[PDB]
Design an enzyme around this catalytic site. Structure first.
Site, PDB file in Angstrom:
ATOM      1  N   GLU A 216      31.434  41.248  66.945  1.00  0.00           N
ATOM      2  CA  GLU A 216      30.477  42.363  66.944  1.00  0.00           C
ATOM      3  C   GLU A 216      29.706  42.566  65.636  1.00  0.00           C
ATOM      4  O   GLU A 216      28.643  43.179  65.657  1.00  0.00           O
ATOM      5  CB  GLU A 216      31.132  43.687  67.372  1.00  0.00           C
ATOM      6  CG  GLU A 216      32.193  44.265  66.428  1.00  0.00           C
ATOM      7  CD  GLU A 216      33.592  43.690  66.611  1.00  0.00           C
ATOM      8  OE1 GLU A 216      33.766  42.658  67.310  1.00  0.00           O
ATOM      9  OE2 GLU A 216      34.536  44.275  66.036  1.00  0.00           O
TER      10      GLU A 216
ATOM     11  N   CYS B 234      40.739  40.499  66.729  1.00  0.00           N
ATOM     12  CA  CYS B 234      41.498  40.764  65.492  1.00  0.00           C
ATOM     13  C   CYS B 234      42.946  41.330  65.872  1.00  0.00           C
ATOM     14  O   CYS B 234      43.576  40.344  66.264  1.00  0.00           O
ATOM     15  CB  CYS B 234      40.768  41.726  64.554  1.00  0.00           C
TER      16      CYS B 234
ATOM     17  N   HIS C 288      35.604  39.349  63.764  1.00  0.00           N
ATOM     18  CA  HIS C 288      34.984  40.429  64.528  1.00  0.00           C
ATOM     19  C   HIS C 288      33.607  39.953  64.967  1.00  0.00           C
ATOM     20  O   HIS C 288      32.642  40.012  64.180  1.00  0.00           O
ATOM     21  CB  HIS C 288      34.844  41.690  63.685  1.00  0.00           C
ATOM     22  CG  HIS C 288      36.146  42.350  63.365  1.00  0.00           C
ATOM     23  ND1 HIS C 288      36.582  43.492  64.004  1.00  0.00           N
ATOM     24  CD2 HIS C 288      37.111  42.023  62.476  1.00  0.00           C
ATOM     25  CE1 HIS C 288      37.758  43.845  63.515  1.00  0.00           C
ATOM     26  NE2 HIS C 288      38.098  42.972  62.583  1.00  0.00           N
TER      27      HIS C 288
END
Ligand SMILES: [Cl-]
Ligand SMILES: [Cl-]
Ligand SMILES: [Cl-]
Length: 265
Positions: free
Chosen positions: A228, A96, A226
């Protein structure tokens, strides 16, 4: 052990900002069976008269990682982390803000636009390589992109194509506002950047860049989403996994089909 430079803030003042990031690193650690040794680097140490001191620390790492962050603090230092990675062929992964600094870095140091920035950090830049799209903006503000979105992998020889098991469309989750400026795609391409994933495979003015790579290098990848936000111990985020693999100087067997967790339902 595998030395990764984590470019942001010291542990003491990070709070819980990197909780999900570190979880994902832990998933990858398990799946690869490698001892991860993260170096937490204060991004502000990579800017100013003495920054060569900090750069030297990055040169001794197996990988260099730039996560999402808040405010304009350490932007120049994060750009400098991407520069070290690009100039020394040290595996790089950005998420990002990490993708945005890769774009800014390349724009300044290869394209030669010294004032290149995001609109977020310099409103008066004449080369806003990252900016709010017109369709996202009004006079009072702009959209806060959250949630899931289709990601088109548009380069078949890319890292993205490989790690998502050749799926043409994957689904990842977002938290961002500013996109790569579509007007500068050729300049970025000429400077060595490959736009490997997008929201719109026609490359209109509404085409949002989801992933960039530098194929001159062993491993240089940065994504807008993202990763994650979608990761478990048994199904680690392929982006993080491939980064850690590259840093460990290891191969990995990618599945024949992309996990259903990252495919369109
Ligand atoms: Cl930071
Ligand atoms: Cl790879
Ligand atoms: Cl953003």
């Amino acid at each position: 052990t595998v030395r990764i430079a984590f470019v942001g803030k010291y542990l003491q003042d990070a709070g819980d900002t990197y909780f999900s990031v570190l979880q994902c690193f832990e998933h990858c650690q398990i799946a690869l069976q490698v001892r991860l040794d993260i170096l937490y680097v204060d991004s502000e140490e990579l800017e100013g008269p003495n920054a060569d001191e900090a750069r030297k620390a990055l040169l001794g790492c197996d990988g260099i990682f730039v996560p999402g962050g808040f405010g304009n603090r350490g932007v120049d230092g994060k750009c400098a982390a991407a520069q070290v990675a690009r100039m020394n062929n040290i595996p790089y992964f950005g998420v990002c803000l990490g993708m945005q600094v890769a774009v800014i870095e390349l724009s300044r140091n290869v394209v030669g636009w010294s004032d290149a920035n995001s609109e977020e950090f310099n409103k008066e830049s004449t080369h806003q390589v990252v900016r709010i799209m017109d369709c996202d903006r009004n006079k009072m503000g702009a959209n806060m992109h959250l949630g899931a979105c289709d990601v088109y992998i548009v380069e078949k020889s890319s890292i993205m194509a490989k790690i998502y098991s050749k799926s043409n469309i994957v689904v990842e989750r977002h938290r961002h506002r500013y996109e790569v400026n579509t007007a500068y795609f050729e300049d970025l391409r000429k400077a060595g950047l490959c736009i490997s994933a997008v929201t719109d495979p026609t490359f209109s003015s509404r085409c949002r860049v989801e992933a960039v790579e530098n194929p001159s290098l062993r491993f240089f990848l940065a994504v807008q989403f993202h990763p994650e936000f979608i990761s478990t111990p048994m199904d680690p985020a392929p982006t993080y996994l491939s980064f850690m693999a590259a840093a460990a100087k290891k191969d990995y067997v990618w599945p024949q089909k992309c996990s259903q967790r990252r495919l369109k339902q």
